[PDB]
Design an enzyme around this catalytic site. Sequence first.
Site, PDB file in Angstrom:
ATOM      1  N   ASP A  59       0.834  -1.193   0.000  1.00 49.53           N
ATOM      2  CA  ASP A  59       0.000   0.000   0.000  1.00 49.53           C
ATOM      3  C   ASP A  59       0.873   1.248   0.000  1.00 49.53           C
ATOM      4  OD1 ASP A  59      -2.714   1.329   0.376  1.00 49.53           O
ATOM      5  OD2 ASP A  59      -1.677   2.043   2.175  1.00 49.53           O
ATOM      6  N   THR A  92      -4.211   6.537  -2.392  1.00 52.28           N
ATOM      7  CA  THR A  92      -2.872   6.785  -1.873  1.00 52.28           C
ATOM      8  C   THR A  92      -1.828   6.811  -2.985  1.00 52.28           C
ATOM      9  OG1 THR A  92      -2.931   4.436  -1.250  1.00 52.28           O
ATOM     10  CG2 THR A  92      -3.065   6.058   0.528  1.00 52.28           C
ATOM     11  N   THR A  93      -1.531   5.642  -3.542  1.00 55.97           N
ATOM     12  CA  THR A  93      -0.430   5.504  -4.487  1.00 55.97           C
ATOM     13  C   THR A  93      -0.677   6.302  -5.760  1.00 55.97           C
ATOM     14  OG1 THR A  93      -0.575   3.214  -3.712  1.00 55.97           O
ATOM     15  CG2 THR A  93       1.243   3.770  -5.183  1.00 55.97           C
ATOM     16  N   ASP A 390      -8.670  -0.223   4.037  1.00 58.76           N
ATOM     17  CA  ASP A 390      -8.867   0.314   2.698  1.00 58.76           C
ATOM     18  C   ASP A 390     -10.086  -0.277   2.004  1.00 58.76           C
ATOM     19  OD1 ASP A 390      -6.511   1.478   3.410  1.00 58.76           O
ATOM     20  OD2 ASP A 390      -5.337   0.731   1.713  1.00 58.76           O
TER      21      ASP A 390
HETATM   22  N1  LIG Z   1      -8.509  -5.386 -12.622  1.00 61.80           N
HETATM   23  C1  LIG Z   1      -7.976  -4.167 -12.876  1.00 61.80           C
HETATM   24  N2  LIG Z   1      -7.790  -3.738 -14.143  1.00 61.80           N
HETATM   25  C2  LIG Z   1      -7.261  -2.531 -14.417  1.00 61.80           C
HETATM   26  N3  LIG Z   1      -6.881  -1.664 -13.464  1.00 61.80           N
HETATM   27  C3  LIG Z   1      -7.011  -1.961 -12.150  1.00 61.80           C
HETATM   28  C4  LIG Z   1      -7.578  -3.261 -11.777  1.00 61.80           C
HETATM   29  N4  LIG Z   1      -7.592  -3.298 -10.432  1.00 61.80           N
HETATM   30  C5  LIG Z   1      -7.078  -2.127  -9.978  1.00 61.80           C
HETATM   31  N5  LIG Z   1      -6.732  -1.330 -11.009  1.00 61.80           N
HETATM   32  C6  LIG Z   1      -6.137   0.026 -10.900  1.00 61.80           C
HETATM   33  O1  LIG Z   1      -5.110   0.050  -9.903  1.00 61.80           O
HETATM   34  C7  LIG Z   1      -5.139   1.294  -9.199  1.00 61.80           C
HETATM   35  C8  LIG Z   1      -4.783   1.088  -7.730  1.00 61.80           C
HETATM   36  O2  LIG Z   1      -4.813   2.331  -7.037  1.00 61.80           O
HETATM   37  P1  LIG Z   1      -4.448   2.379  -5.473  1.00 61.80           P
HETATM   38  O3  LIG Z   1      -2.945   2.352  -5.337  1.00 61.80           O
HETATM   39  O4  LIG Z   1      -5.285   1.339  -4.769  1.00 61.80           O
HETATM   40  O5  LIG Z   1      -4.975   3.830  -5.022  1.00 61.80           O
HETATM   41  P2  LIG Z   1      -4.918   4.267  -3.473  1.00 61.80           P
HETATM   42  O6  LIG Z   1      -3.441   4.337  -3.172  1.00 61.80           O
HETATM   43  O7  LIG Z   1      -5.627   5.601  -3.436  1.00 61.80           O
HETATM   44  O8  LIG Z   1      -5.643   3.155  -2.757  1.00 61.80           O
HETATM   45  C9  LIG Z   1      -6.534   1.873  -9.390  1.00 61.80           C
HETATM   46  O9  LIG Z   1      -6.462   3.255  -9.754  1.00 61.80           O
HETATM   47  C10 LIG Z   1      -7.177   1.055 -10.493  1.00 61.80           C
HETATM   48  O10 LIG Z   1      -7.532   1.882 -11.606  1.00 61.80           O
END
Ligand SMILES: Nc1ncnc2c1ncn2[C@@H]1O[C@H](COP(=O)(O)OP(=O)(O)O)[C@@H](O)[C@H]1O
Lengths: 526, 525, 212, 78, 527, 74
Positions: A59, A92-93, A390
């Site tokens: 994360d 976050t990321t 989360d």
């Molecule tokens: N099955 C999938 N196919 C395409 N993109 C995905 C899939 N699962 C997650 N993602 C992408 O991965 C990203 C993960 O973001 P994340 O690091 O969780 O944000 P945060 O740090 O705010 O939690 C999301 O923006 C999403 O668009």
Amino acid sequence: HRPVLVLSQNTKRESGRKVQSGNINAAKTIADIIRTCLGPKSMMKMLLDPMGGIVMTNDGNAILREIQVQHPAAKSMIEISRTQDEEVGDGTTSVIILAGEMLSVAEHFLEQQMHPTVVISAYRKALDDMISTLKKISIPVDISDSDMMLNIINSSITTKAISRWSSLACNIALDAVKMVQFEENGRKEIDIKKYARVEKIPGGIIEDSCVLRGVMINKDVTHPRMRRYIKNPRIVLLDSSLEYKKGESQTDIEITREEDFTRILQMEEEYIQQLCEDIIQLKPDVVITEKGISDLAQHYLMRANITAIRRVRKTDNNRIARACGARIVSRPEELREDDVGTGAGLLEIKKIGDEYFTFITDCKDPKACTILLRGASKEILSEVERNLQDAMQVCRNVLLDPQLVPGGGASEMAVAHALTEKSKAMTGVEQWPYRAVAQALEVIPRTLIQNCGASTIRLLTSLRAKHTQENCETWGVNGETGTLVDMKELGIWEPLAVKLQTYKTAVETAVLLLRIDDIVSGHKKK
Amino acid sequence: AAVKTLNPKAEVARAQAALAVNISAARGLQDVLRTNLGPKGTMKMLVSGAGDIKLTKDGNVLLHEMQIQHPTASLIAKVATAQDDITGDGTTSNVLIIGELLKQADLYISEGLHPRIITEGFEAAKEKALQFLEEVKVSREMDRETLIDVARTSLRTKVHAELADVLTEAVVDSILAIKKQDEPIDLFMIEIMEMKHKSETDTSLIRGLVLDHGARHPDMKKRVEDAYILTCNVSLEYEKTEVNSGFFYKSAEEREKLVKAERKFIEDRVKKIIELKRKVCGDSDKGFVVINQKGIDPFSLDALSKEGIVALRRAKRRNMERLTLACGGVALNSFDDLSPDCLGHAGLVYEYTLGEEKFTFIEKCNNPRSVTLLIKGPNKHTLTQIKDAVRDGLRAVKNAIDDGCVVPGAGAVEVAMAEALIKHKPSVKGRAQLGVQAFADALLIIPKVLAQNSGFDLQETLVKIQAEHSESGQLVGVDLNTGEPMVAAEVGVWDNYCVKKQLLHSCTVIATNILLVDEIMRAGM
Amino acid sequence: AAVKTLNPKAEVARAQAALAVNISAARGLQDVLRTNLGPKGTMKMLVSGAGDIKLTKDGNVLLHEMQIQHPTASLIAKVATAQDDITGDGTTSNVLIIGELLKQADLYISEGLHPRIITEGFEAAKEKALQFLEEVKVSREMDRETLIDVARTSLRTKVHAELADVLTEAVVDSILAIKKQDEPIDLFMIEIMEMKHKSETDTSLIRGLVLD
Amino acid sequence: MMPTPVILLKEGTDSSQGIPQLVSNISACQVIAEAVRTTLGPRGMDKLIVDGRGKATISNDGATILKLLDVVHPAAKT
Amino acid sequence: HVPKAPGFAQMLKEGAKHFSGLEEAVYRNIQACKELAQTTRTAYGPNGMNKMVINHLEKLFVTNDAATILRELEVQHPAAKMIVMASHMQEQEVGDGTNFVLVFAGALLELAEELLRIGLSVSEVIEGYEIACRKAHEILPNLVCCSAKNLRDIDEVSSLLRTSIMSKQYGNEVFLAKLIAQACVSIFPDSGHFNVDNIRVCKILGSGISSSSVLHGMVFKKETEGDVTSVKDAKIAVYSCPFDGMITETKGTVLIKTAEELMNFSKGEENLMDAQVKAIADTGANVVVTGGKVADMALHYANKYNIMLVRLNSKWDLRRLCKTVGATALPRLTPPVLEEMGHCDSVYLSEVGDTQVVVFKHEKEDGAISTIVLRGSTDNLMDDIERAVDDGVNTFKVLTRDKRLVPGGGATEIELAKQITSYGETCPGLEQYAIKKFAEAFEAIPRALAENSGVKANEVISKLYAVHQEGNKNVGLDIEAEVPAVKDMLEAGILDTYLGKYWAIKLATNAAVTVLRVDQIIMAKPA
Amino acid sequence: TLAFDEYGRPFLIIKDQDRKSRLMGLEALKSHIMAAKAVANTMRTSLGPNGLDKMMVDKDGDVTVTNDGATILS
Ligand SMILES: Nc1ncnc2c1ncn2[C@@H]1O[C@H](COP(=O)(O)OP(=O)(O)O)[C@@H](O)[C@H]1O
Ligand SMILES: Nc1ncnc2c1ncn2[C@@H]1O[C@H](COP(=O)(O)OP(=O)(O)O)[C@@H](O)[C@H]1O
Ligand SMILES: Nc1ncnc2c1ncn2[C@@H]1O[C@H](COP(=O)(O)OP(=O)(O)O)[C@@H](O)[C@H]1O
Ligand SMILES: [Mg+2]
Ligand SMILES: [Mg+2]
């Protein structure tokens, strides 16, 4: 030894291009750390703590909090991920990569003898057009449907480590928010930190983890004669002690007669029996307090068939008050029938690994629950605890704002074509930094193919051509295979509050770090 | 690296670098802990900084008391902590699976493949390994002769098979007389006392309790037969009021009146005890024993000794739980409702002194439901061998009673599970074909280590064992005496179902998470 | 240890310990030199203590000018020195065979077997591999178009294939005008001069001599 | 706190840039002009400069005073 | 307590570092070479600023030429030395355009970082840069509009040499163009090899640049040791032996055996030296220049027969004197010189700038050698004009090798940016992104000309593509005032070094390609 | 200020300027008079026929009693 006639001793001065282009490289350095932790093909990052512990996570918030930096602009990016962690869950990321890319294109215009206030005034005009684009491509959500809410929380945990146990973690995080959704007066609130406690116990398997319909604590009974299994107890919550303590005064007793010393020792026993007679008038079964219980109070509750718990925490008393519907009273002679926790289900003092745990479960309508996590060790149980935090906050955003944005690259490409078509009517010097905001949004579909190993040239040329037409507009990047699949068929949907907080924080991070042309370091304070 | 730019005093490991750190450290813990698996393992002498000898070969005590500073070794030690916390045995075999799940996966990841492709094969292999474990378990209705062979397997692997014949009679007979009628057996009802009297092969099973404190008065009786246990929680010693009061007197004749009056509330508690002895028909011997968790002043000890009441002091917290079940009385916290219904009964209450340290024995109860294993080891380090083996054996028979099925022994489970993954290897239909092969070869380390510690060949033994399994239907295993494949269900070598179930679950998740680590770094300064 | 008794400042390695020293050091030289084998390999920039740039990817120049202090790394560097002394090419491929002969044997010695039993199979495999090499060799009577394709393979693995077309005409045409009538060719008759005149893609073959 | 590379710029060199460099050069020439400021005109005094060896040289010429100051500033050497 | 990460597979170094990959090796080599491009970007162009660079020898170097700055900076980054040695090869080949290499290759590596972080690896950016480099060598013969062919005299080269002068000496573009015209044309070999070593610079401290001139001959910084300094005949006998007599080689020992040989030895040695000086006085010689020392007896007969003596301690200056007056250095002692005598017009002495010099001034036969006598207020100013003088001599050697010229001042780089973009849009492949980035590196070269003039480079670079609509191909930059409204380069006369542009594009492309080939860096412990 | 500029740069003009001494002021003429009057007050007592001599000790320990003004100051 004569002192040197100086001014502003032992401090540094730095201005010019070394601070404007110096804060960009500090922002690019943090964005390259967590760049491999965005897509579903990400990997964990083992960290080492100064206390001796180990944080093995992927994360973006938990990684940046364990990094101690010395650069001043690098300390600003860590506080950005702390803001995204408290507002939304899975935001976050994505902000740290986007703020590093919006500053990457901002470094190009600083070399063209352009003032930084021109780029920020173009960033604020671009920020107001990214909010209006997401509200047009949104979709209303039926929050009463159970299968619709499971697809939203599954899209947020596909990146995390609980994607393997996706059928179990989605049902736990959905039932945790729907139990703690309490509304007393005319104001809806969801408190998933004070009432949705996530307790982890080392041992067992992860498939046996489930959200309990009630609370649980790590406390044994005060006496072995007390019952460890009550069917329907009447729980009375206390706050004061059941002992005899010194008053808040300077009390001193002069003992001159022979019968005076034996009378005070008898009045201490009659005072405990008076407050023990005041709690049995409502016929309870379980007495729970926060302070100590003397052995004279344990004797009167033993023959009255009352199970007493001794030193339950204050945060656990506030959590059991919502589950059983009891009132935390602080006066045993002021107990009422409304302060009794009726409606509580089965109470059982189980033992999990040579340690007793008090279970208060099977309630009728509890307003606070406890997620029981059981795994291999405390290392991976801290991962599931950080992933369920989360997973419960992304369900809180849908219940307060039922709008979904097509994630997985489809959100960033739908606005990058909207900023490109709107830039044709600019006709000014702010037109070219307005175009760079649409190009800075390309780093989110860039990351989903760089993590799975796909090509970034043959895919981004075809993905940019899919958004040339206004009909489809929802084509994203599939991180599982690596091709272009529509998000209406995959089911990857992100909430509106996640995507709005991502764009509002990444722009204003570039607003703050572009107005910095000087750095003074070396002074002290009080 | 990016971490070197922000913090110049922060070490880091890259993608191909952090994988070599975790795998080579897992081989370091594997090559050390493989010399103690099974009955043919060697004893390890562990010396701390003080100089005391900790002679043991359990996998949990070896990993904790080892001077190692490594982040990979701290992850395996936490998984090994929970294996010895909820189910006892299964700690040495826990580390050897993780040591092979990372070594067999290194043969594919270094040869071009991605680490996530291997972890997708581990989940598909765990699903077949969990279904195959439910087909090989044997339900034997928890017979008392079955629990002997379950306890004998866990006790041999920690002692030299001369005390395993003695400790099996002390573990099986202790776990049966605790709870009945499908009740969860509480392990707090068994007291473990360390003595020094005779020898290591003299550990008996006391049917009652053994208290580590004796009588605190020289006029009390040392041997009491047909006693009445009065379990108390009151404080017979002198206590003051909570409010600071003090005394005030005028003459010296009124000074002695206050000392007589300040002990009136103390002697009122003693007068309730000596009147209970007169109401239980005291025209006989009629011994009285008061365990009395809280302290007693020597004024009340002198008063109880003249009536003939043995009074102990400073008992444990769980002594009011174990003796209450053993004597059948009621642990009282006051003397307001004293009655003969709350009194206990024991046929013999005696004490014994071992180097100015008395030990109170309570025996001859009707239905105690609380026993005490009296370990009488000669040396101090030999007491740690028996205590760590009793709790390894008590948690083995506790899982065999709670779970309704028994799992077979040494090689009757791991060899049959690896052969089931070969025939289901083309069932995945994808890139994870080599992940099931890495999981099946990692389960074969349990017949490989047991053939290596016994002195036999490693590869020549695994050919003959897999030949007898493929040409028959019996779950054949390893014999640590002849090397021939012998069935474990017939020779009396069993194992627990929850140990093998968690070995397929705790080792698999901790291997799929370590293989997905590529940024080992130390920051925070 | 016995060596620690007589000489207390003498470190030692035991039977299962000294095998892990040599195998882990053979994989260390294998993972470095495997990124520059063939025409698609990567260049390496070697900087000494003075500050001069030595940009090359030959296996003999990489092992000599590398900051490594290991006894196993010094044994492979002695074998790699004699490979580039008598026949030129074959130095980068020499280290990868040694790094794989100890890695593939690590999977059998650690699984119960003795290291001497693995060495008995290496000699039985080397005799069959040597007889198989004499059956797959192709004789083409030393044609001048055959020597172009031989020199093109060795030059493409050390340059970016734009100078390999130039240096092929400077190597094949230089080796033919030395000796005839089945005489051993002396390599001391070819002088190598370093100029700075035009560019790297201008290396010509002077038919006489160039004096410095 | 900004420049922390793995390989530094040249060795350890510091270099000013822009408008603070030019005022640093102008104000440096004002200090070295005070050693010839009081030596102008018939009512102008002389100056005495002593080196490290103890040799005293009293003069009022600009070619004599400025050569004994041992100025190491780059702009003031002009 | 706190654990740490140890070595993994090949940590065998004893204090040395290691770099592998794109982020640790390739991206860090780009950012290190970017700092050298931003360093010399201010000193590029006619409005460039000087730089007071102090080396390890604690001496001052102030200049605006990028070649002499990098020789004093002790650069320690290995990839940054590749762009320094590429600029040093520009000075050895043509002598002009060394800074053009730092701007172009600094922009080639900077735009390559935008391609590696968005797309193709180094296997296709390098192959994409090589296609656009070969196409850049096809537009440069098409951009030639003028030639240095007609009227090769002091009138035409006074305007064709102003571009190399005004880039480093903006205010003195008229005086230094005429001084380089009366020196380079006067040493012409009548359609032969133009030697740049035949022009020397005699730094005379004194008045300003308006008093500088070029003398047809050589000017030294030594004395006479005599009183025959006024020589008008100028028949010079050049010798390389020390003018003190003929001594033996092995040991040397005078062997006296009687009283007559002791008394006649001192008088016989003076009569032997008297016969050798009068042997060259009867031949008509007036100047006797030697390389070694001169005894007191040689100075006695030099003043008696009225001949001038010149001491030249440098052996390289003695060979230049033989090509000045047309003589030959004789290794033996003084013979009767038959035909290897020197012939000048006037050899005299004068104290210019409190420096007694010896001038071998030619009056009638003007063209044999040239020496530009430069005057300056400081010694640091005369070193900067000497660099501008050497850039004028090196430009004259370029026009001897190739008489073609291209319109500079930003006009060439825009037309190179337009044609490469035309080839990039007609390439149906994945390497067309590196061709479009190769043309944008030519766009940043007139960007450095506008940023040094205080003009906004966005409005400057927009007017260049607007006036280059397929038929102009000549409009550059007018940096004379703000709000430019740029004019034609052929009417202003800003065109220089077509062969300099041919080598600076080739050297900077091969320098940026060699940096991108480096994927793994293994450095040693510096000591 | 000394040894520092208003923009933060080090302000070094001459070498080892921190260990230098420079006085222009109004006491630079006053320091020359007070240094010369103490020499004149020393030689005042050795003037005339009633002038008392001075005892001079060399660096080697040699003692010379001098009255003439040339050898005293030398
Ligand atoms: N099955 C999938 N196919 C395409 N993109 C995905 C899939 N699962 C997650 N993602 C992408 O991965 C990203 C993960 O973001 P994340 O690091 O969780 O944000 P945060 O740090 O705010 O939690 C999301 O923006 C999403 O668009
Ligand atoms: N009598 C026996 N014969 C054959 N194998 C045995 C015998 N006793 C124990 N084993 C084997 O030894 C292995 C390890 O036993 P033990 O050391 O008690 O557990 P752990 O290794 O987890 O600490 C078990 O998997 C079991 O199959
Ligand atoms: N009169 C002028 N008008 C506009 N530009 C000019 C003029 N004179 C010179 N320039 C520009 O100044 C630049 C000086 O480049 P320079 O530093 O001499 O290159 P190098 O370092 O290779 O010699 C040239 O590219 C030229 O375009
Ligand atoms: Mg997420
Ligand atoms: Mg120039």
